[PDB]
Each structure stands twice: as C-alpha cells, then as structure tokens.
Ligand SMILES: [Cl-]
Ligand SMILES: [Cl-]
C-alpha cells in the first residue's frame with residue numbers, strides 16, 4: 001500500500017471484460033511528507049475518490065479482490081502523522 | 083496498471099506453449115504527461131493494439147487471466163486522458 | 170521481507186471493507202545498518218507495533234495471510250540484528 | 254516479460270526439490286535498443302537457451318507454471334525485435 | 341531469483357506464527373561480477389546457510405499459510421559469466 005493523489009482519469013472503450021464499469025484514475029505516489037515522487041500509476045476507483053484527494057492505493061494480486069486489476073484505491077486518507 | 087505506447091513487436095518461434103497465438107508488443111511506459119520514461123516492457127496484446135497507440139498495461143498475476151506464463155498484457159486502449167489541479 | 174521503522178500512522182474512514190478495524194502504519198525501509206532509505210510504505214499492523222520500533226514487513230500475496238486487499242503488513246518485531 | 258541476454262550460468266547442489274534438474278542462467282536485462290542495462294537476474298532455462306542469445310523472460314507467479322520456487326524463467330528465444338516511430 | 345551474500349541474521353520474538361522456528365538472514369543482492377549492490381533483504385533460510393555464503397534467493401509467492409516473500413532456495417556452487 002502507498003499514499004497517492006488522484007491526478008486525473010483515464011477513459012477506454014476497447015478494454016477487458018473485467019474492466020467493465022470501472023473508473024480509471026491517474027494516481028501519483030506521494031512520500032511520507034506528502035510530496036509526490038516521479039512515480040505515477042493508473043488505478044481503479046472503488047471507494048469513489050475525487051480529484052486532489054489523498055487516497056490509499058493497494059497494488060498487485062491484492063488489488064484483484066476489489067479482475068485483471070493490479071492497482072486500486074482501497075481508502076481515502078482522513079489524516080496522516082509522521 | 084500503467085500507461086504505455088506500442089513502440090514495436092517481438093517475434094519468437096521457440097516459445098512456451100502458453101504463448102501460442104499471442105502477439106508480443108514492445109511497450110514503453112509513459113508518464114501522466116504521456117512522455118515515455120526509460121522503462122520498457124514486452125507485453126501480450128489481447129485487445130488488438132497497433133503501433134503508436136496508447137494502451138493500458140496490466141502486470142503480474144492479474145495479467146494471467148487474459149496456466150499462462152504471461153505477466154504483462156494490454157487490457158485496454160486509451161480513449162482520453164485528463165490531468166488536473168484543483169482549488 | 171525487509172527491515173523498517175514505524176514512522177507514523179494513517180487514518181481513513183472511507184476505506185475498503187477488508188480494511189475495517191486495521192491499524193495503518195507508515196513504515197520507512199531500513200538498510201542492514203538500520204539506516205532508513207528514501208522509500209516509505211503504508212503497512213497494516215498485526216503484531217501491535219509502536220512508534221520508533223523496528224519491524225519486519227512482508228509484502229505481496231504473502232501479506233494477504235494476515236481475500237484481503239492487503240499487500241504489505243508487519244509480521245514481526247525485530248529483537249536484534251547483526252551484520253557479520 | 255522483458256528482453257534479456259544469457260550472460261552465463263549458475264550451479265547449485267544444495268537447492269530446493271523443485272529446482273532439481275534445472276539450468277540456472279544469468280540473464281542481463283536489455284532495453285528496446287538491445288542495450289544491456291545494469292539489472293541482472295538468475296532465471297530458469299526451459300526452452301533451452303545458449304550464451305549470447307536474446308530471450309524473453311517471464312517473472313513472478315507466472316514463472317511457477319513452467320509448487321515451484323521459480324519466480325523468473327525463460328519462456329522464449331527472440332527471433333527479431335522491431336522498434337518503430339509512426340507519422 | 342537473484343544472487344545474494346549472507347551478511348547477517350535477524351532475531352524476532354513477537355513474530356507471525358508461520359515464522360515460528362525460522363532463521364531470518366540479511367542478504368545483500370549481488371551483481372553478475374558478485375559485487376554487492378545497495379539492495380538488501382531479509383530472507384528465510386531453508387537449506388541452512390552460513391555467513392559469507394553465496395546463495396540463490398527466490399522472492400514473491402514462490403517463496404511461500406506462509407507470509408514469506410523471500411527465501412533462500414539454494415547455495416551457489418560455481419558461477420560463470422561469458423563475455
Ligand atoms: Cl464500461
Ligand atoms: Cl540437480
């Protein structure tokens with residue numbers, strides 16, 4: 001899991017049957033200081049996240065249990081402390 | 083899943099039986115600004131993608147469901163992209 | 170598995186059903202000399218770790234064994250380390 | 254899957270029971286330009302690859318399907334790879 | 341799988357039940373020329389490896405009720421890197 005920020009959204013018509021009715025968001029990985037590093041990822045929205053919102057993204061085989069999905073938002077961050 | 087652009091194609095005769103009848107494409111990973119970073123990967127085409135087209139690539143165990151030995155495959159062709167900034 | 174240090178904690182109300190009643194910690198990956206590298210990860214606490222504690226973090230499908238959406242979780246609290 | 258070149262081979266007697274009778278090769282990851290980058294990996298040969306040959310390497314859970322402890326294996330030998338630019 | 345060198349060992353009492361009676365080693369990832377790169381990982385010893393020994397480490401689901409994602413699966417006898 002990692003902290004990311006919805007940077008945008010991706011639309012695709014000719015996609016896999018398992019991706020039907022899914023919202024594809026562009027999420028940039030953040031650090032502990034909430035500063036975005038170069039990494040960016042296309043994840044599936046499940047909890048219903050909006051732009052600018054900091055979310056918790058689970059990736060890999062774990063993300064399937066939300067599929068050919070390998071990355072999905074599994075929570076919206078309320079607060080963080082370091 | 084990441085954004086990629088079909089750079090080319092890979093041909094292989096002596097391959098695994100699970101790769102039978104599969105088109106192996108060369109896909110370079112893109113950023114949010116659609117600028118390709120140094121990373122590149124050989125992925126399996128499933129939706130039927132052509133050269134120069136921006137596609138969505140799924141990797142790992144998820145790509146298998148396209149007993150495969152596939153660990154990366156195209157699962158969609160990008161229609162539009164949207165980067166934003168709020169407030 | 171890697172060596173990490175509990176930097177902090179993450180709170181989230183609107184999260185996945187599998188994450189209900191879970192402690193989300195911010196763990197920074199350490200080297201063999203216990204020096205934290207730039208990498209940081211949000212992991213689920215299972216053994217009950219506190220701030221400043223050095224823990225062992227398991228990642229991937231192995232982290233599920235804590236149908237979870239978990240891909241990183243603390244699976245042990247380090248007693249001692251040695252680098253011969 | 255990525256492009257790699259068989260650099261060498263690794264021998265091990267005291268190994269797992271799933272690695273019995275397996276050829277362990279040292280494969281260095283290549284770019285799309287077939288330039289070897291710093292990455293190197295010990296993969297299991299299945300198609301029968303030799304030194305200097307460019308091969309396709311599958312990694313992760315997919316490599317098990319070659320109770321294996323395999324997480325990286327050669328699943329094909331590259332015949333030709335084409336890079337392109339369109340319009 | 342990658343080439344690694346047993347740098348040390350990790351001890352933990354409050355660990356997962358699946359990790360009971362397991363030897364946790366500190367393994368530094370090596371290159372083809374056997375020079376250790378910055379990467380380091382805590383792996384589970386299964387074949388019985390000692391310090392300074394070059395071992396083959398399998399990672400991910402392959403290493404596995406286990407929560408193991410990295411384990412030693414062999415001790416390297418010899419290596420060769422044809423140029
Ligand atoms: Cl749809
Ligand atoms: Cl043998």
Ligand SMILES: [Cl-]
Pocket residue numbers: 359360361362
């Ligand atoms: Cl014990």
